[PDB]
């Protein structure tokens, strides 16, 4: 399904690549896109964080907000690639 | 009957999906909608809890209060879906 | 009831925000306000700890002692806010 | 029987070797091969998980889907070995 | 009776204080004082363990052996206190 | 919110620019504006230091004290700019 | 109690001030005052180390030995202050 | 019994002294003396690991293999001491 | 890949040869080709600097801008050689 | 087994000798022999890195690729020795 | 506080003015006023040296000894000024 | 104990005095007295190096070899003093 495929993008192409130090910076500017919380985020395995994000918004808004953040944290090289892969999947369901 | 159908919603679409940890949190904020009790709730198999809830209020008030709680515990993704399915069944008997 | 409302304050505004490391420090200076115990406290889910505290003192003394501790552990930012919310609820029942 | 032998493969050669962390990753990409569920899977002893898988599909489809997953989660070293052992048992009943 | 009082010592002053991790270590060096057993001990609620100990030796030998163990597992702070309380009760019946 | 915007100023315009050697000098003259401490400050990632500062004073007093320090450590070029950006945000909420 | 007050001294006036590097040096000359151990000490959060020290000696001997060590590791500035605060508390119970 | 005494050697003189990092290295070269396994060993409290070792070989072969490993991992200082203590106990039963 | 080969050029033929003093001069005229920053650049191991450059522009624009800078800092002897090697690799993929 | 012996070569003769700085350089030219990844490699204890390498290729291809890399990073002194030791073990199984 | 003000004198009026060559000469005649050491002093940033001096003597004896040294190393022009500023601060607390 | 006293000599009279540059020279001529290793020594805090030396030889052979090295690296001024202090401690236990 489109859902499973989006998740594979998030996990395999996204988190299975990104580092840590940067995740700490991401957390410092978080809460600006999702109605999550503080102390609550501090130690949550990538899988847990992705799951909590989806349990709230979804594979639609979560992906969009991720794209938006990737553009803020300077991360443009990985933001362009995600945008391209997104469009590739969209074409399959247009 | 409308009753049996509501029960199928509760059990198959509701409890047959939700986790545990969250049930503990539900219990911690319970007693706010139903005239049930304490120590009495601690270990009651989903089937027992649903049955006790209905034996008191019913398939009308129990479902309404469940909808209301699902909106409190942040659980909105599963609350919207329940609300949609509810309306679908209501249309059949309007 | 005033009781349920106080609990919502404790849980949603208090524990649903505070971290862990600090909870360990809290435990190290505990037993100074409540007639609880040792080894007994080591691993007790926030819900369990709140419940045990109330089962002993109550929503009156437990809240007061929490306010007092929040002022000791330097935690003043969250102590002022709790004090303000407390006064807001008190006004409703004055 | 072929059934008991397949189970011995699954349990002794498979699960009696694989780690945990990876099981969490497996769970995150599950539900893609079996008509099982969520929250339902979270804590199920290897024996319980194998049994539920078989109770649904069987020793035929469950083994095939396991082989397929072992190839996805990069796990190729253990996937080749399982494929070899499978062929060895197939020869005995050809 | 002297028996009930000794039990109150064991339970309230002893077990109602001691932790877990240490209980595992106690179990690892057990069977050296009581003619109990293995696998049999692994999961036995403090109340069950105390009861089985007494059902064998009694409130006389069980207490003496507990005192002796408390001195081995380094636990001297709690061993001195138990010895003092013991002497206090002995004086009442001398 | 005004809070998030102030934080973006602090982090992106402030710390994401300033060097290290100078941070050591800042630390040597610190404790003069905030009720923090010693040895406690020695190794705290910019994100940690900003967070601890806010957890005490806030986005109001922390920013004001930062402005004041930036004027002491000769740092005037970056102090004027911060003051200008501050006034720009203030105008939006006047 | 005198105990709680001594602990506040140890933690707030002592450890909440001292650095790390020096703690490593302390550990290198430890075992000379307490019947503790090696490898066992290597990574123990200040709270854990204080607790283990007390669980053995107490708030009487642990404080005395700390005073003595503070005088050895050259640390005299913090040793005089601790001695003064100690005498201040002693006067309250003389 | 000789068994209990050997266990006291293993636990008190051995594991109650050795560190962690080195245990990870031990695990990396394990499986070379005992017919145990992988993933299975990763997280097993010293008590659990000792027990599993004995449940397989015993207090005779387990001790001998431990002595042998202690000589490989360079650990000679602790290997000589264990060998001496072993001989001391052997003399008691010669 | 062309990417890996370009990196080998940068690192082995470029940085593994150039000195320091000159790197300081390079830094003084930097920020003119890449959207990087200040204080941020001061101490970044050649590997870190190359990686940050690529993480922004890439192996295409980073190499081109390097060529351009090598021509400015008078460095022509090493600029001609880089240009020749570049053309040699281009021919392989024309 | 040949496997265990190869591992002893890798760990004791290889990694237990090589430095760090050079490991960073190795990482910069990695991914050219193994189908591993980025950010994923950044902080992985020698034991973890060896294990991941083997979990993919094995003690056959991993050793061969290591030999090949040791010849690239100029490291010839340690490459000749590894090649000699390899041949010595091969002779034992020819 | 008087302490902070003395530090500002030391750092801003003292070290933020004095050169290097002379610091080497100061070091050559040091150890005559403070119970510090050798090799230990060789490379210690002004901030580190001031801090170590205070950590030993204090803002009282350290300042007095500095005044005394400033009079020895011929440095009289800066010694008179320091003495004047000292008296000015003393008057504020007389 | 004689051991602790020897360690105090090593650390306080030895390492707490010696410089760095010379430590690099020591390392270059090391491995000639102890069965240690290379790359392994490069960055090991004085405390770590002393501990590893003792973990191998001891406070007897390590001290003797240190004395011997101190005589080689020309260091005679500190070698005579160590020899004198050694004899002073020996007299106490003759």
Author numbering:
A (entry chain G), B (entry chain B), C (entry chain E), D (entry chain D), E (entry chain C), F (entry chain J), ...: 0 to 93
Give sentences from the paper.
AIM2 contains an N-terminal PYD and a C-terminal dsDNA-binding HIN domain. The AIM2PYD filaments in turn act as the platforms to nucleate ASCPYD filaments, resulting in inflammasome assembly and caspase-1 activation.
We fused AIM2PYD to an N-terminal non-cleavable His-GFP tag with only a two-residue linker. The AIM2PYD subunit in the filament shows a six-helix bundle structure that is highly similar to the AIM2PYD crystal structures in isolation. In the filament, AIM2PYD forms the core while the GFP tag packs tightly outside. Estimation of resolutions by Fourier shell correlation between the densities and the fitted molecules gave ~5.0 Å for the AIM2PYD region and ~11 Å if GFP is included. While the GFP-AIM2PYD filament has the symmetry of a right-handed 1-start helix with 138.9° rotation and 6.0 Å axial rise per subunit, the sequential intrastrand subunits do not make direct molecular contact. If we sequentially label the AIM2PYD subunits according to the helical operator, the three types of interactions that dictate helical assembly in the AIM2PYD filament will be between the first (i) and the fourth (i+3) subunits for the type I contacts, between the first (i) and the sixth (i+5) subunits for the type II contacts, and between the first (i) and the third (i+2) for the type III contacts. Type III interactions are mediated by Gly38 and Lys39 of α3 and the nearby Asp15, Asn16 and Ile17 residues of another subunit.
